Amino acid sequence: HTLVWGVWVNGVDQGDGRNIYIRSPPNNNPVKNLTSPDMTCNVDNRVVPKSVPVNAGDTLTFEWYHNTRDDDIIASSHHGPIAVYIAPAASNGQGNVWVKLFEDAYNVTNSTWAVDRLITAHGQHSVVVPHVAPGDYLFRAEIIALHEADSLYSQNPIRGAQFYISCAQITINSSDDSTPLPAGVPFPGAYTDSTPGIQFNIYTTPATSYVAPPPSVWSGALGGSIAQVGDASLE
Ligand SMILES: OC[C@H]1O[C@@H](O[C@H]2[C@H](O)[C@@H](O)[C@H](O[C@H]3[C@H](O)[C@@H](O)[C@H](O[C@H]4[C@H](O)[C@@H](O)[C@H](O)O[C@@H]4CO)O[C@@H]3CO)O[C@@H]2CO)[C@H](O)[C@@H](O)[C@@H]1O
Ligand SMILES: *[C@@H]1O[C@H](CO)[C@@H](O)[C@H](O)[C@H]1NC(C)=O
Ligand SMILES: [Cl-]
Ligand SMILES: [Cu+2]
Structure with a gap:
């Protein structure tokens, strides 16, 4: 159970974004x-x-x-x-x-x-903004909690993989658009019962054997990290 508060840009706190620039759910219950x-x-x-x-x-x-x-x-x-x-x-x-x-x-x-x-990281994880066309975008952050993903939701609706999903409203102003954004995958749709990394038993199977759901990361992506980039206690 977790939600997004807001975003930092180049280590600068953009302020509380809930129902403001995050498309916030009314609570932190997972999607399954x-x-x-x-x-x-x-x-x-x-x-x-x-x-x-x-x-x-x-x-x-x-x-x-x-x-x-x-x-x-x-x-x-x-x-x-x-x-x-x-x-x-x-x-x-x-x-x-x-x-x-x-x-x-x-x-x-x-x-x-x-x-x-x-x-x-005190809830903080980052991506480097890619060189796509200037315009308006959604960034969808997704955490998959697997503490019950040994089961599928479709078979046993009180277990299953859990998705904490948060979409941020981002406007990209300056970009040479050196890497135009391609088509991607549908959500719902990209993940099915068969997709690797949806059904997995972290109780019995080594975590080195884990394979995250496709698709792969786009060649135009500029990476990212999980790490604190600033101190919310001083805001
Ligand atoms: O630990 C291994 C074991 O896990 C079992 O699953 C547990 C989870 O471990 C446990 O974290 C989880 O706790 C939930 C709880 O069920 C929710 O009711 C609660 O929801 C809160 C929320 O946290 C608050 O922010 C909000 O304000 O109120 C709601 C109450 O409505 O959130 C906590 C986590 O934060 O409980 C699971 C079981 O239900 C697996 O089932 C088992 O297989 C594993 O071995
Ligand atoms: C899952 O969602 C689909 C489409 O929204 C819905 O028709 C179906 O009833 C849902 N499954 C469960 C268990 O509610
Ligand atoms: Cl839970
Ligand atoms: Cu939870």
């Missing part, structure tokens, strides 16, 4: 029905009033929280990967539009899942 419209931008997808100004090459940092900003972020039990996707805001998240900018599942070195490191 893979076929549901709720997989796009969670259960309350609608245009919110603001969209955060950024340029290509900027560092955009998502800040998640559990109950209060900068608390314990998400329960330790919720081991799993983190992905970020982009789509033209034009799409309202409909059709084959979602392009992956970032994937992080398990780090063999430190033996920590992305979710583990996000708690350590």
Whole structure:
């Protein structure tokens, strides 16, 4: 159970974005029905009033929280990967539009899942803004918690993979548009019962054996990281 508070741009806090520039759900309950419209931008997808100004090459940092900003972020039990996707805001998240900018599942070195490191990062994880066409975009951050993904939701609707999905309204101003955005995948649609990384038993199977759901990260993506980029306690 976790939600996005707001974003930082190049380490500068953009302020509380809930229902302002984040398309926030009314609470932190997971999405589990893979076929549901709720997989796009969670259960309350609608245009919110603001969209955060950024340029290509900027560092955009998502800040998640559990109950209060900068608390314990998400329960330790919720081991799993983190992905970020982009789509033209034009799409309202409909059709084959979602392009992956970032994937992080398990780090063999430190033996920590992305979710583990996000708690350590005080809810902060980033992507570098790609050189797409200037315009309006949704950035879709997705945490998959696997603490019950040994089952499928479609078979046993009180278990299943859990998706914490948050869409941010981002306006890209300056960009040489050196990497025009391609078509991508639908949500709902890209993930099915068969897709790798949806059904997995983190109780029995090594986390080195884990394979995150496709698609792969776009060649135009400029990477990203899970790590604190600024101190919410001084805001
Ligand atoms: O630990 C291994 C074990 O996990 C089992 O699943 C557990 C989770 O471990 C546990 O984190 C989870 O806790 C949930 C709880 O069910 C929710 O009711 C609660 O929701 C809160 C929310 O946290 C608040 O922010 C909000 O304000 O209020 C709501 C209450 O409506 O959120 C916590 C997590 O933060 O409970 C799971 C079981 O239900 C697996 O089932 C098991 O297989 C594993 O072995
Ligand atoms: C999942 O979502 C689809 C489409 O929204 C819906 O028809 C179906 O009833 C849902 N599944 C469950 C278990 O509710
Ligand atoms: Cl839970
Ligand atoms: Cu939870």
